[PDB]
Amino acid sequence: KAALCLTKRSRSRKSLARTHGFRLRMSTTSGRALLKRRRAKGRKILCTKTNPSSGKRASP
Amino acid sequence: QVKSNPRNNLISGQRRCGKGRNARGIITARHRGGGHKRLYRKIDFRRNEKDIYGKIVTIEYDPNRNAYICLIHYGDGEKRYILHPRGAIIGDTIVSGTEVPIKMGNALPLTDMPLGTAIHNIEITLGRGGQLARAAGAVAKLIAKEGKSATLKLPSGEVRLISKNCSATVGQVGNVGVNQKRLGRAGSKRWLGKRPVVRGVVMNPVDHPHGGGEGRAPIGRKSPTTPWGYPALGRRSRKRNKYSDNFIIRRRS
Amino acid sequence: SKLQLKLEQKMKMKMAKKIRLRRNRLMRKRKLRKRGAWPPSKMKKLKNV
Amino acid sequence: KKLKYPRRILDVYQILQSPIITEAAIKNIADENSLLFTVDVRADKKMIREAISNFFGVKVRKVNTLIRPDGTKKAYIMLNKEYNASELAKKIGIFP
RNA sequence: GACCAGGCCCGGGCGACUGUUUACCAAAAACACAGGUCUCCGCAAAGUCGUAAGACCAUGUAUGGGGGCUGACGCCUGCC
RNA sequence: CAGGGCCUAAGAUCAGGCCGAAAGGCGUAGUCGAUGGACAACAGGUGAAUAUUCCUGUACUACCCCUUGUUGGUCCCGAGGGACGGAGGAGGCUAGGUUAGCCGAAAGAUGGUUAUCGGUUCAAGGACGCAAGGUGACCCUGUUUUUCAGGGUAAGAAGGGGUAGAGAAAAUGCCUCGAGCCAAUGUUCGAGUACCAGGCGCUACGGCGCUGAAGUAACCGAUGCCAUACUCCCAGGAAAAGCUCGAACGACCUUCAACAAAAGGGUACCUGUACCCGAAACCGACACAGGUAGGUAGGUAGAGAAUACCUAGGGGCGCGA
RNA sequence: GUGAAACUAAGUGGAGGUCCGAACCGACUGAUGUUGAAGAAUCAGCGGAUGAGUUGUGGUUAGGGGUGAAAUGCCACUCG
Ligand SMILES: [Mg+2]
Ligand SMILES: [Mg+2]
Ligand SMILES: [Mg+2]
Ligand SMILES: [Mg+2]
Ligand SMILES: [Mg+2]
Ligand SMILES: [Mg+2]
Ligand SMILES: [Mg+2]
Ligand SMILES: [Mg+2]
Ligand SMILES: [Mg+2]
Ligand SMILES: [Mg+2]
Ligand SMILES: [Mg+2]
Ligand SMILES: [Mg+2]
Ligand SMILES: [Mg+2]
Ligand SMILES: [Mg+2]
Ligand SMILES: [Mg+2]
Ligand SMILES: [Mg+2]
Ligand SMILES: [Mg+2]
Ligand SMILES: [Mg+2]
Ligand SMILES: [Mg+2]
Ligand SMILES: [Mg+2]
Ligand SMILES: [Mg+2]
Numbered sequence: 001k002a003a004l005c006l007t008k009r010s011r012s013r014k015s016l017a018r019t020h021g022f023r024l025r026m027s028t029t030s031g032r033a034l035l036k037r038r039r040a041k042g043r044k045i046l047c048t049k050t051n052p053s054s055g056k057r058a059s060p
Numbered sequence: 061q062v063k064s065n066p067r068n069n070l071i072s073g074q075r076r077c078g079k080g081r082n083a084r085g086i087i088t089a090r091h092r093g094g095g096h097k098r099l100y101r102k103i104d105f106r107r108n109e110k111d112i113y114g115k116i117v118t119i120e121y122d123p124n125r126n127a128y129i130c131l132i133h134y135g136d137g138e139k140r141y142i143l144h145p146r147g148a149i150i151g152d153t154i155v156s157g158t159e160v161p162i163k164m165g166n167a168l169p170l171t172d173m174p175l176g177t178a179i180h181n182i183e184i185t186l187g188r189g190g191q192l193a194r195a196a197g198a199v200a201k202l203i204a205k206e207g208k209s210a211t212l213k214l215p216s217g218e219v220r221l222i223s224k225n226c227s228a229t230v231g232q233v234g235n236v237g238v239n240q241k242r243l244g245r246a247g248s249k250r251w252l253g254k255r256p257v258v259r260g261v262v263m264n265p266v267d268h269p270h271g272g273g274e275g276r277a278p279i280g281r282k283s284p285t286t287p288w289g290y291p292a293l294g295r296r297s298r299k300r301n302k303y304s305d306n307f308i309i310r311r312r313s
Numbered sequence: 314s315k316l317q318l319k320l321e322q323k324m325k326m327k328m329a330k331k332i333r334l335r336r337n338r339l340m341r342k343r344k345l346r347k348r349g350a351w352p353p354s355k356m357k358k359l360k361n362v
Numbered sequence: 363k364k365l366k367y368p369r370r371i372l373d374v375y376q377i378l379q380s381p382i383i384t385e386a387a388i389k390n391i392a393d394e395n396s397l398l399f400t401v402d403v404r405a406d407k408k409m410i411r412e413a414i415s416n417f418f419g420v421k422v423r424k425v426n427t428l429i430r431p432d433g434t435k436k437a438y439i440m441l442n443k444e445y446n447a448s449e450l451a452k453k454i455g456i457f458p
Numbered sequence: 459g460a461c462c463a464g465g466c467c468c469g470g471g472c473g474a475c476u477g478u479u480u481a482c483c484a485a486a487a488a489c490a491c492a493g494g495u496c497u498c499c500g501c502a503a504a505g506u507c508g509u510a511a512g513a514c515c516a517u518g519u520a521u522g523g524g525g526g527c528u529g530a531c532g533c534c535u536g537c538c
Numbered sequence: 539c540a541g542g543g544c545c546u547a548a549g550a551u552c553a554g555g556c557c558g559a560a561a562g563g564c565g566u567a568g569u570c571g572a573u574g575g576a577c578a579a580c581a582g583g584u585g586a587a588u589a590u591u592c593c594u595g596u597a598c599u600a601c602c603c604c605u606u607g608u609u610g611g612u613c614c615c616g617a618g619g620g621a622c623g624g625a626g627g628a629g630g631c632u633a634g635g636u637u638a639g640c641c642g643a644a645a646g647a648u649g650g651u652u653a654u655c656g657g658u659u660c661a662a663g664g665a666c667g668c669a670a671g672g673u674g675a676c677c678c679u680g681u682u683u684u685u686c687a688g689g690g691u692a693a694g695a696a697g698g699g700g701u702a703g704a705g706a707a708a709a710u711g712c713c714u715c716g717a718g719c720c721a722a723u724g725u726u727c728g729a730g731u732a733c734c735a736g737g738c739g740c741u742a743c744g745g746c747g748c749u750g751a752a753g754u755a756a757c758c759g760a761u762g763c764c765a766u767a768c769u770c771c772c773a774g775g776a777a778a779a780g781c782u783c784g785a786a787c788g789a790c791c792u793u794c795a796a797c798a799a800a801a802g803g804g805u806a807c808c809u810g811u812a813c814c815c816g817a818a819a820c821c822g823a824c825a826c827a828g829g830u831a832g833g834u835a836g837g838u839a840g841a842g843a844a845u846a847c848c849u850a851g852g853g854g855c856g857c858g859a
Numbered sequence: 860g861u862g863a864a865a866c867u868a869a870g871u872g873g874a875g876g877u878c879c880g881a882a883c884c885g886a887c888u889g890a891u892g893u894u895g896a897a898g899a900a901u902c903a904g905c906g907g908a909u910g911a912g913u914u915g916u917g918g919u920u921a922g923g924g925g926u927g928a929a930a931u932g933c934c935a936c937u938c939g
């Protein structure tokens with residue numbers, strides 16, 4: 001019943017950082033290649049979807 | 061007949077879950093999925109604990125096989141499920157061992173069974189557990205024995221040699237009328253978690269070797285074909301030289 | 314001698330039924346907390362809703 | 363059994379950073395006998411209780427922490443009803 | 459007495475039926491289906507995925523598991 | 539209160555292990571992983587912006603502290619329990635609602651009239667308790683079998699005890715003792731100098747200080763509670779920990795050490811907490827006629843959570859003439 | 860009803876991919892919209908609504924692939 005463009009819905013931050021998170025990119029070799037080449041471009045933010053385990057941004 | 065008990069320690073919840081998905085997570089075995097959650101009953105197929113006297117307390121339904129199953133007690137308080145033999149009634153008594161009466165539900169090595177007997181739940185390998193003829197209404201006759209080897213006629217009609225020291229159980233497997241049911245509606249398939257199958261002829265060429273000819277397709281394939289490109293009809297797949305071959309005598313007809 | 318057994322088993326019974334019932338209210342309160350009509354004050358401002 | 367490890371390793375003299383003086387806090391003193399102290403985020407309640415209990419030499423009923431949206435821990439320290447708050451308010455320099 | 463609240467009948471084709479489907483031009487006579495039938499498979503099964511190890515099939519065992527065509531029920535299914 | 543300091547599902551990672559040009563792939567114990575299991579708090583007040591969090595009342599968990607009572611406790615292991623479907627209807631009840639009764643005010647410029655308008659509220663928790671409810675075998679006689687009445691049978695229910703086998707607990711077999719049991723709800727404390735219609739006075743005319751009457755009954759009645767209670771069906775309906783029980787095996791600790799109890803006093807880990815959330819704050823590039831899980835469910839008419847007109851509460855659509 | 864059984868009202872019972880119909884899921888016709896209020900809507904009607912149902916949270920399968928009640932459909936407004 002929802003429009004095509006609605007692909008990005010309200011999804012728990014917990015779920016997202018379990019996907020694009022830091023600790024995930026660290027696991028695979030391809031991820032470490034990721035972080036090298038982000039660091040090369042010198043991005044202010046390495047992993048965009050990340051998330052505090054507990055704190056002000058914490059998902060329960 | 062079917063009256064639910066509380067849970068004996070033989071009924072657990074641990075099991076494979078993705079049905080038809082392998083490690084890679086792919087559907088290997090097509091059409092499964094959906095259907096009622098089940099619990100695994102731990103059957104005793106080996107019947108290995110010898111020389112104690114068991115009593116059939118009840119008869120229970122099992123979702124994992126079309127046969128019935130019987131809860132039996134012992135004088136030792138151990139409880140086991142066995143496949144329900146045909147005609148066995150509650151209050152009955154069974155026993156396994158070597159020198160034993162021959163009646164329904166007793167299990168013994170093939171050295172001691174009088175030729176002509178109707179047998180089920182047949183080990184092919186010493187102490188591996190019973191393997192052959194476990195389904196509803198399945199039975200195999202012990203036709204002849206010679207040397208170290210016994211000869212059976214399996215429910216497929218195939219005649220085959222096995223070891224004379226492999227245990228088996230007297231009597232046919234119960235619930236004979238099961239294939240007399242008529243499911244009657246689609247939903248009643250789905251309840252068993254058997255999902256709908258598409259005919260080859262329907263799908264597009266990419267998807268299957270009988271691919272869409274314009275209106276309706278005769279199968280132009282010079283031969284009926286597996287999804288994967290093999291002849292569908294009458295091509296024997298039995299591994300040419302399997303170790304088994306020396307044992308097998310006449311082939312199912 | 315039968316009066317001893319009866320008074321001991323009524324002591325036990327009173328105990329078990331006490332703990333049982335305590336347990337039961339607790340469980341109810343929990344269910345309600347999950348659903349979210351809990352503090353009976355809360356329900357009593359929405360009664361007419 | 364063993365030495366009692368404090369929840370983290372901090373150095374107690376840095377945990378109580380400062381009294382927070384605004385119109386708000388002062389009447390928490392008046393009504394509640396409760397001081398208001400900005401403290402180190404890394405600091406706990408047991409640490410704060412020992413710290414004030416020894417430092418100003420007052421027995422403290424209960425502590426309540428808070429964490430600002432700015433990431434700075436803030437603590438309501440409600441002393442006992444024997445020790446008056448305004449005592450420590452004059453002793454410190456917080457004037458009601 | 460407002461709001462709310464079935465037009466119905468006589469025919470024929472197709473598909474038995476409830477279902478599914480071309481997100482955003484096609485909802486059907488297409489797909490599924492219960493049922494039928496052919497064929498493979500004796501358990502270290504056939505089949506599928508993997509370079510392999512192994513996984514599914516199945517913690518099942520021929521009244522079960524693959525695959526092909528047809529498509530309820532009724533009458534049938536001829537020659538080469 | 540919600541997560542973490544507890545437990546596991548799908549799944550994920552995976553010591554050693556098997557395989558593989560490399561990166562890696564499979565996989566066992568282990569360890570992660572809630573959308574589930576376990577586990578203790580409510581009413582009133584304050585309130586520029588927080589409140590089951592702060593205040594005042596009664597509570598409740600987990601430890602520690604002392605008295606008393608025992609001598610072995612602790613983990614590892616053995617067990618019971620936790621522990622589970624759908625559909626159906628019948629009960630027994632509350633929540634709400636309506637009408638009386640009691641109480642206070644009332645004149646609302648009209649032909650009449652008090653037939654009018656307000657109030658009648660209270661939680662968690664603790665003690666008690668259970669029938670017209672539901673369950674407790676059979677046989678004879680009747681009430682329609684049923685709710686029942688007389689007799690009888692000897693475990694015949696929740697619930698306990700004993701014994702036997704390699705056998706502690708358990709499971710299993712034999713023996714015995716028990717006619718009650720079950721749980722929503724109810725009575726009483728909590729609870730009144732609480733709350734509240736009005737009344738009095740101030741008005742920075744915003745709000746404020748002051749004193750407070752009655753506080754019961756009947757009939758409707760749930761989709762909520764007992765309740766995993768029943769009856770039926772086939773498609774046959776999670777695990778693990780806390781919890782209860784317990785000998786041998788192994789490890790460790792041991793006397794004012796540890797455990798067992800009823801009181802008494804004490805003691806109290808992190809993180810979330812603003813605001814919006816049928817949205818102008820999320821998702822749609824917009825202050826966009828759209829999408830967004832759950833909870834609470836008043837009146838009159840009505841079969842109804844449809845519809846119409848309304849209460850509480852919220853709004854009059856950010857261009858007008 | 861006969862000795863067995865069959866046959867037939869009755870009551871009880873509450874089956875169903877039953878019926879009508881809100882929520883909810885869809886998307887059949889028409890009108891409007893077409894530099895839209897909106898990159899698929901609004902309005903009036905319409906289909907299913909105890910099931911082969913709907914949905915939440917957390918997961919799975921990945922491009923010589925996956926998934927498909929099969930439309931070359933879908934795989935972040937992109938899919939021979
Ligand atoms: Mg961004
Ligand atoms: Mg179970
Ligand atoms: Mg159990
Ligand atoms: Mg994987
Ligand atoms: Mg088909
Ligand atoms: Mg096609
Ligand atoms: Mg494709
Ligand atoms: Mg494929
Ligand atoms: Mg081809
Ligand atoms: Mg073709
Ligand atoms: Mg043609
Ligand atoms: Mg309403
Ligand atoms: Mg404050
Ligand atoms: Mg806090
Ligand atoms: Mg027609
Ligand atoms: Mg014509
Ligand atoms: Mg059709
Ligand atoms: Mg679909
Ligand atoms: Mg279309
Ligand atoms: Mg259609
Ligand atoms: Mg269309």
Ligand SMILES: [Mg+2]
Binds near residue numbers: 479
């Ligand atoms: Mg189609």
Ligand SMILES: [Mg+2]
């Ligand atoms: Mg078929």
Ligand SMILES: [Mg+2]
């Ligand atoms: Mg194979």
Ligand SMILES: [Mg+2]
């Ligand atoms: Mg066809």
Ligand SMILES: [Mg+2]
């Ligand atoms: Mg697992």
Ligand SMILES: [Mg+2]
């Ligand atoms: Mg791995």
Ligand SMILES: [Mg+2]
């Ligand atoms: Mg390794």
Ligand SMILES: [Mg+2]
């Ligand atoms: Mg593992």
Ligand SMILES: [Mg+2]
């Ligand atoms: Mg965890």
Ligand SMILES: [Mg+2]
Binds near residue numbers: 572
């Ligand atoms: Mg949870």
Ligand SMILES: [Mg+2]
């Ligand atoms: Mg907790």
Ligand SMILES: [Mg+2]
């Ligand atoms: Mg809690």
Ligand SMILES: [Mg+2]
């Ligand atoms: Mg507020």
Ligand SMILES: [Mg+2]
């Ligand atoms: Mg409050």
Ligand SMILES: [Mg+2]
Binds near residue numbers: 595732
């Ligand atoms: Mg009070």
Ligand SMILES: [Mg+2]
Binds near residue numbers: 599
């Ligand atoms: Mg306690």
